[PDB]
Design a protein around this ligand. Structure first.
Ligand SMILES: [Mg+2]
Ligand SMILES: [Mg+2]
Ligand SMILES: [Mg+2]
Ligand SMILES: [Mg+2]
Ligand SMILES: [Mg+2]
Ligand SMILES: [Mg+2]
Ligand SMILES: [Mg+2]
Ligand SMILES: [Mg+2]
Ligand SMILES: [Mg+2]
Ligand SMILES: [Mg+2]
Ligand SMILES: [Mg+2]
Ligand SMILES: [Mg+2]
Ligand SMILES: [Mg+2]
Ligand SMILES: [Mg+2]
Ligand SMILES: [Mg+2]
Ligand SMILES: [Mg+2]
Ligand SMILES: [Mg+2]
Ligand SMILES: [Mg+2]
Ligand SMILES: [Mg+2]
Ligand SMILES: [Mg+2]
Ligand SMILES: [Mg+2]
Ligand SMILES: [Mg+2]
Ligand SMILES: [Mg+2]
Ligand SMILES: [Mg+2]
Ligand SMILES: [Mg+2]
Ligand SMILES: [Mg+2]
Ligand SMILES: [Mg+2]
Ligand SMILES: [Mg+2]
Ligand SMILES: [Mg+2]
Ligand SMILES: [Mg+2]
Ligand SMILES: [Mg+2]
Ligand SMILES: [Mg+2]
Ligand SMILES: [Mg+2]
Ligand SMILES: [Mg+2]
Ligand SMILES: [Mg+2]
Ligand SMILES: [Mg+2]
Ligand SMILES: [Mg+2]
Ligand SMILES: [Mg+2]
Ligand SMILES: [Mg+2]
Ligand SMILES: [Mg+2]
Ligand SMILES: [Mg+2]
Ligand SMILES: [Mg+2]
Ligand SMILES: [Mg+2]
Ligand SMILES: [Mg+2]
Ligand SMILES: [Mg+2]
Lengths: 46, 271
RNA sequence: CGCGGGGUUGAGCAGCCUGGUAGCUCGUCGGGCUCAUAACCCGAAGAUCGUCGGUCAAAUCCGGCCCCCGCAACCA
RNA sequence: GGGAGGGCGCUUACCACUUUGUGAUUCAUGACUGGGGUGAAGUCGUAACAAGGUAACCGUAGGGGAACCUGCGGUUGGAU
RNA sequence: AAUUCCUUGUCGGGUAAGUUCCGACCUGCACGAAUGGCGUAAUGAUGGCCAGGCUGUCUCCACCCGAGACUCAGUGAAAU
RNA sequence: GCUCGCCGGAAGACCAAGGGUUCCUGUCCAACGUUAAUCGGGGCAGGGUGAGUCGACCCCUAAGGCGAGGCCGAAAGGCGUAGUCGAUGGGAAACAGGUUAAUAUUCCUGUACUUGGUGUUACUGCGAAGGGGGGACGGAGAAGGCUAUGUUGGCCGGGCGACGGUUGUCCCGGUUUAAGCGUGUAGGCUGGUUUUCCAGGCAAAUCCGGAAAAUCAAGGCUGAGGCGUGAUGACGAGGCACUACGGUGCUGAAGCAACAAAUGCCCUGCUUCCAGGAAAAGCCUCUAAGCAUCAGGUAACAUCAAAUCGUACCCCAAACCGACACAGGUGGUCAGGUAGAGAAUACCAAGGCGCUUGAGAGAACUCGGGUGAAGGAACUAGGCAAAAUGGUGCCGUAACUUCGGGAGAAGGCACGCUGAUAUGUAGGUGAGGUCCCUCGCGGAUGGAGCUGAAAUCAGUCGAAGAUACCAGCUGGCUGCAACUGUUUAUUAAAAACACAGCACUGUGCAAACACGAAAGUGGACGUAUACGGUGUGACGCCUGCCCGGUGCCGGGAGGUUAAU
RNA sequence: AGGACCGAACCGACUAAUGUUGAAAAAUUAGCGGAUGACUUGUGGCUGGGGGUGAAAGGCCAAUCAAACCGGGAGAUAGCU
RNA sequence: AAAAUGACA
């Protein structure tokens, strides 16, 4: 059975990447929540 | 000619092909080709706005000259060609100065014939000259709406337009739909009647014969569910409703025209 | 065996619609035209309202009864 | 001493009886059904024979309980 | 009848025996003409019935070969 | 170490995606390993990835994203022009061998090639954002020439048999060599050269386009393979010795022909068909402004530079997605022998594994299989399941029909081995000879060797010769749906949905309709033979009566009637 | 030539059996349908919740769908256990 | 304008 996670680095950084967060007003507030909470690694960008 | 395929397969029984040997069987003229990308019915927002569109075969748009703005300068018809973007074969046209274009094909055009446009051109099938110079009671095609716009009326396969009367600065036309219009007497109108008239006499034969044309299947509203289509519902083929488009508007009778700005150009509504 | 609609001169159909008031078409009878029968014309007769019971009065208002025509008897 | 040759036995070839599988044709028989014929004062009508009371008929098409009726063309084997 | 309650309607075929099946009757509770009618060769992992071959499906089970099930050594769950 | 067994279109070998030390040594068995463990993809420590040519980077674009100004929108914001990003596509160059415990088209040896800067010369009109050319494109089918590759023969090296034979038509092994450079074949496309003129290629143009005239029957482009050369080199069985006994060092013969042959190459080719089959850059050419000293361009010569990042390892799995060392999922590339039409199946080679609990016993009962007396659907909701047929050639084959079908209908016959026809035929292949020759990678003639079906006759063995795996069950009547297709991922695959066809109706282009507070966009770079909605569902014969009710269309007199 | 025929790769899922605290949160075994097309597959894009998409089953939208997931209104309300 | 029918011997 073909599972629901077929990983792909290029599609992960194009969608949940940092520069994906910065390009939209709603995404920019997503980071400001993570920084305020005090998260170690913010988005996904390994 | 219309040729009926022999029933060697259940799905080739009812195939009638309109085949024209005279169509050139090489490659189209290279400098007149551009890229043509499908949409599948999707627009800016990415949602479908016209249904049953998608798939098909990759095609290339050919730059058909609709305006026909070359006064003087006779030309010859080099060859006839098959245009997938339309219903009427096109013709490659070579002018005396060495310029090549594409034009639509009147029914009485072969390879090697000679045409020319302008207000002084002769009255023969293929020439373009303003409807002011065109004699009344004639049968024309590729008609315009505004002087120099390019031409919209009577462009499909086998259709034409009758010129009924010439009143002052306006000319009255009877269209192929039965409606009567008035257009400004300075519109150009290529003289003739569009070719490939056997385009009715064809039956695609099978489902794939339409699927490979950019036509996706349509699903009747009586099969849908009540939340998808107004007809919907029913335990065993019940209707009980006045026929309606999926958006609630009435079909099957309801007039839905409103311009109020070009109504001054209509003589008799189609009937 | 719960709920409707109905029983009218020989046939079909009104009058029951707020209680005095019985009609229409066909049909039966007696004459008339015809050689004669149909057809047509002129005249007549025929029901007390399904039954048994309950106000000055009853086809009508009410109940039982007899018969007919209908609908509804479902969830497991 | 045996040899040549022959018979018996075995074996192959041809073929009768017989057994299969599919057809063709012919003869009876079959619930029900189509038309036809005959029969007694039956029922509904009156199509045709006269100008048969809408002249008849031929081909074709549609309709009707039935004779039949109507459209289109054709003939005189129609009266005045 | 994918439609017919009474109904296993009645007659015929098939079977020793046929509420199913095929043909016919019409008494259509409650078929019927593009929410289409009646036919139709080919097609179908579609619904119903019949026949030939075939067989442990069955009368009625018997034997045999392998993995388990049982004993010894190691590790060692779960529902309640 | 010796046997046995299994996969062998894979359970073998190599990649992209993905993972991130899992790779190699030494060392340890507390924990992880469904058991023990000296073992491990475990703990600890050390080691390991070498690039002008392979990729990424880089130049160019598709779908599409972002979008200076801008248009639009209560604010956020939406769309979009010039531009600029985006490969799953286009653009320069390296091959053979040797070596490490671990890397190698990356190091070493040998032999190459590509693009830039600079310098020396010899020539020279150079010059772009613009003109043109090319890059540049589909599906099917058919042969023809080849190669990889395999079989056989020769040659070389070795051998004379554990038990009857085996100095011979006997047995085993080897018979390999690249990129590059020259040559230009089988073939495939196109006529070339020159001269004069021109309303077109937004300006110009000697280039494309077009119009004329002469001339010659030739020229040019493309092109797999073959043959030289690289290579009197490397490789090479096996012998010689050290053996730390893991392997290491020395030497080294033959290294040729025939036949068969691809799904790979010529082939982006040829023929044919309708459903008519990406864009831009690299590259060639023409000129404008501009420079005519220069500058710049063409060719040879010498030198310099080619930076940065990946390079271990698993990659159909114990290292990826499934919570696990999980009977699941995962795109591409290579394709040996025998029998076979085959990438099916059966047995094998190269290679890799025996699937991380065993040892006993031989009860019931369950799971997976084998055979069965006589009967053959009597069981059952129902022939569910088992059983059965199963190949090639030939004979033969009905009702019905849209003339194609039905049909592989049904039902039958032959099939192994040896010999003769023929000391292997028909056919395919084709060496020396021989002649001609535009003399070459030629053309005829020429049949040595090689390979090789199919058939007939006769004999022969078994119970059985498509002997194994592989491999149709067949007829009769009937409802529904014309047919191939699609559907409830995970209880419903159908009579449901779709379909080609038919009908009604809307729609005159700034179209109807749809997404959207709007701008705008799909419809469509389409124009009534077109497009949208609705119903029916191939084909044949058909589609009767009702406009009272509910809608819809037309009407414009009369009545009723809102804001003002 | 064929939405032509038989049949492996490939795609699918008609029947029976086992499994139902499985090897597997839908598979294995023996059979089965399509296999030049309305086919199948790799990479990258687009459409977003009363919205998408749908050869139409209320199917599918991260093991969830007659209206997803996460946070907030929120200690909603509960004549009910 | 309407205008039908009449066993057999
Ligand atoms: Mg349609
Ligand atoms: Mg439905
Ligand atoms: Mg609704
Ligand atoms: Mg119904
Ligand atoms: Mg008469
Ligand atoms: Mg008459
Ligand atoms: Mg019977
Ligand atoms: Mg134990
Ligand atoms: Mg094996
Ligand atoms: Mg580690
Ligand atoms: Mg342990
Ligand atoms: Mg380790
Ligand atoms: Mg770029
Ligand atoms: Mg934008
Ligand atoms: Mg801006
Ligand atoms: Mg790429
Ligand atoms: Mg070879
Ligand atoms: Mg390695
Ligand atoms: Mg696994
Ligand atoms: Mg294991
Ligand atoms: Mg796969
Ligand atoms: Mg195999
Ligand atoms: Mg046992
Ligand atoms: Mg058995
Ligand atoms: Mg037995
Ligand atoms: Mg027996
Ligand atoms: Mg038997
Ligand atoms: Mg029984
Ligand atoms: Mg029985
Ligand atoms: Mg079975
Ligand atoms: Mg079997
Ligand atoms: Mg039935
Ligand atoms: Mg079907
Ligand atoms: Mg199907
Ligand atoms: Mg399902
Ligand atoms: Mg299913
Ligand atoms: Mg339908
Ligand atoms: Mg139908
Ligand atoms: Mg009708
Ligand atoms: Mg097929
Ligand atoms: Mg097949
Ligand atoms: Mg599926
Ligand atoms: Mg789900
Ligand atoms: Mg809700
Ligand atoms: Mg609150």
């Amino acid at each position: 059975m073909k599972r629901t996670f077929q990983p792909s680095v290029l599609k992960r950084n194009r969608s949940h990447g940092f520069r994906a967060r910065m390009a939209t007003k709603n995404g920019r507030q997503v980071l400001a929540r993570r920084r305020a909470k005090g998260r170690a690694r913010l988005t996904v960008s390994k | 000619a219309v040729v009926k395929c022999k029933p060697t397969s259940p799905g080739r029984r009812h195939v009638v092909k309109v085949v024209n040997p005279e169509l050139h069987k090489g490659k189209p003229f290279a400098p007149l080709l551009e890229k043509n990308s499908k949409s599948g019915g999707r627009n800016n927002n990415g949602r479908i706005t016209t249904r049953h569109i998608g798939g098909g075969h990759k095609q290339a748009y050919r730059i058909v000259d609709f305006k026909r703005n070359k006064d003087g300068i006779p030309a010859v018809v080099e060859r006839l060609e098959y245009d997938p973007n339309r219903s009427a074969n096109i013709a490659l046209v070579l002018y005396k100065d060495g310029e090549r274009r594409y034009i639509l094909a009147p029914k009485g055009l072969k390879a090697g014939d000679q045409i020319q446009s302008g207000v002084d051109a002769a009255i023969k099938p293929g020439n373009t000259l303003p409807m002011r110079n065109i004699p009344v009671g004639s049968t024309v095609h590729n008609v315009e709406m505004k002087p120099g716009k390019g031409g919209q009326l009577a462009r499909s396969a086998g259709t034409y337009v009758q010129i009924v009367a010439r009143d002052g600065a306006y000319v009255t036309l009877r269209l192929r739909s039965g409606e009567m219009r008035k257009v400004e007497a300075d519109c150009r109108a290529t003289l003739g009647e569009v070719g490939n008239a056997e385009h009715m006499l064809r039956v695609l034969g099978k489902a794939g014969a339409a699927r490979w044309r950019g036509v996706r299947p349509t699903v009747r509203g009586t099969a849908m569910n009540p939340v998808d289509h107004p007809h919907g519902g029913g335990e065993g083929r019940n209707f009980g409703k006045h026929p309606v488009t999926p958006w609630g508007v009435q079909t099957k009778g309801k007039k839905t025209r409103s311009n109020k700005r070009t109504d001054k150009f209509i003589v008799r509504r189609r009937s």
